[PDB]
Design a binder for this molecule. Structure first.
Ligand code: HEM
Ligand SMILES: CCCCCCCCOCCOCCOCCOCCOCCOCCO
Length: 460
């Protein structure tokens, strides 16, 4: 029934069938023997691995409903516990997703785009203060993407030097490092034993509990100040839907799903976006001619006075292609987020029993040599046709595909476009390291780029 793969040991599974270069290189090596679809054992748990564009498309698109289940991540499950939009399943997920999708479509008063532009203006104002001083951009890029989520859920942004904000930021971004760490990957395989002993899991738990506590306080603060005729944000809207469903005891719109849906938005909405911006500017230091062409396109379509608007992207295929290529080569979620099959499901030769975990290895699509001339080399041409127009690419699935496709895709892409262009419109860039010496190779389950310094040199 199950797809082929290495014979598992009891308890340990295919632990010893790796890892060498890494978990990605193992899967790549495993793939080269067993094919594009294979079974691997994480401890005693069987997982089906989907490799290559065709197989991932065939599962997530052509059988969308079967492959619409969400798998657990062991280090954060004790916080989420199947609540919230990311880790919910079945009807719960369906309802939270529908509500969330519909809600963020409107904001609040001012739109998400307008908030991103404002954030972009705040960023520029801030960068301008350094006067070309060296800086690591990690914090500011974590801040700007968190502020967009804060704007959406709390109806406001925080100042960049606010200690309340900075403390939460530090809390958040320690958690991501720990979640991705090798120790948490060991915890994934053997949580049942390891949950009784000290480890990264305890620290992840406390960090996320602190964040949840802050969110709970905001919720109470929102309720206490609520104008039901004028919702300010996601929480107000959710609070109003809570009231409407007050009678229905089969309603998913209760307190627990509120707290953890908000946590979910921060969990999925900050790290990947920030790192994408950080990785992007690393590439822009390594390839100044690209950066130069982007600025020329900014100057031609937008000019030097008004700020970029999302409308501009349609007229800026080169920049848009650069952003596509940044996301592709960046490959920030190489294994995807874990799925499960919602029923005994027929896939190629095989039957995947109900609730079996499935990893869609986005990386193998993003590096698919069918769709990309130069998979391992930065090449904006990958997304440009012979007329210099943006071209769609079947391999390009950084946000995944199907019913679980990134709920924030449009928000993510808008941030990417407006931040990159608003920054480059106002600043050129430099750093101590010669372009030729800049190393793009990442630092376990994460694909995190190395730290670096950059200058933002005001223009005009
Ligand atoms: C460059 C930035 C981002 C990238 C590359 C990205 C990518 C992804 C990927 C690969 C998934 C897994 C989908 C699956 O299960 O197959 C996902 C899920 C998700 N993302 Fe994003 N994301 C980004 C930013 C955001 C933002 C800004 C938001 C919200 C504003 C967001 C919200 C979510 C949510 C809620 C899910 C869970 C969807 C569900 O289970 O229904 N993400 N994202
Ligand atoms: C020799 C010892 C080897 C130990 C090897 C352990 C292997 C275990 O590795 C498998 C780990 O699971 C890989 C899939 O995890 C993906 C988790 O991604 C977390 C991303 O969370 C943020 C979600 O939002 C991102 C998009 O918005």
């Amino acid at each position: 029934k199950l797809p082929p793969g290495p014979s598992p040991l009891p308890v340990l599974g295919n632990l010893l069938q790796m890892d060498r270069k890494g978990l990605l290189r193992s899967f790549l090596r495993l793939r080269e023997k067993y094919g594009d679809v294979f079974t691997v054992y994480l401890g005693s748990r069987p997982v089906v691995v989907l490799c290559g564009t065709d197989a991932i498309r065939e599962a997530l698109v052509d059988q969308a409903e079967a492959f619409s289940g969400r798998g657990k991540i062991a280090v954060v499950d004790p916080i989420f516990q199947g609540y919230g939009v990311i880790f919910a399943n079945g009807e719960r997920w369906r309802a939270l997703r529908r509500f969330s999708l519909a809600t963020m479509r409107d904001f609040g008063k001012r739109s998400v785009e307008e908030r991103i532009q404002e954030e972009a203006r705040c960023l520029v104002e801030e960068l301008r203060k350094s006067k070309g001083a060296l800086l690591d951009n990690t914090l500011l890029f974590h801040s700007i993407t968190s502020n967009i989520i804060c704007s959406i859920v709390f109806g406001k942004r925080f100042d960049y030097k606010d200690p309340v904000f900075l403390r939460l930021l530090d809390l958040w971004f320690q958690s991501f490092s720990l979640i991705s760490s090798f120790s948490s990957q060991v915890f994934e395989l053997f949580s049942g034993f390891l949950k009784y002993f000290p480890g990264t899991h305890r620290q992840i738990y406390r960090n996320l509990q602190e964040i949840n506590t802050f969110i709970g306080q905001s919720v109470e603060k929102h309720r206490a100040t609520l104008d039901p005729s004028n919702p300010r944000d996601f929480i107000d809207v959710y609070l109003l839907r809570m009231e409407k469903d007050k009678s229905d005891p089969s309603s998913e719109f209760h307190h627990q799903n509120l707290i953890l849906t908000v946590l979910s938005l921060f969990f999925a909405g900050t790290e990947t976006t920030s790192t994408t911006l950080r990785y992007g500017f690393l590439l822009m230091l390594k390839y100044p001619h690209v950066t130069e062409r982007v600025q020329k396109e900014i100057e031609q379509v937008i000019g030097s006075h008004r700020p970029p608007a999302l409308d501009d992207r349609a007229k800026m295929p080169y920049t848009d292609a650069v952003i596509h290529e940044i996301q592709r080569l960046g490959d920030l979620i190489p294994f995807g987020v874990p799925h499960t099959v919602t029923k005994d499901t027929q896939f190629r030769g095989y039957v995947i029993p109900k609730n079996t975990e499935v990893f869609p290895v986005l990386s193998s699509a993003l590096h698919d040599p069918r769709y990309f001339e130069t998979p391992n080399t930065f090449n904006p041409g990958h997304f440009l046709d012979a007329n210099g127009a943006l071209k769609r690419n079947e391999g390009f699935m950084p946000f995944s595909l199907g019913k679980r496709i990134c709920l924030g895709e449009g928000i993510a892409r808008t941030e990417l476009f407006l931040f990159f262009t608003t920054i480059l419109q106002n600043f050129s860039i430099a750093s101590p390291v010669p372009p030729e010496d800049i190393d793009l190779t990442p630092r376990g389950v994460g694909n995190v780029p190395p730290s670096y310094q950059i200058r933002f040199l005001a223009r005009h």
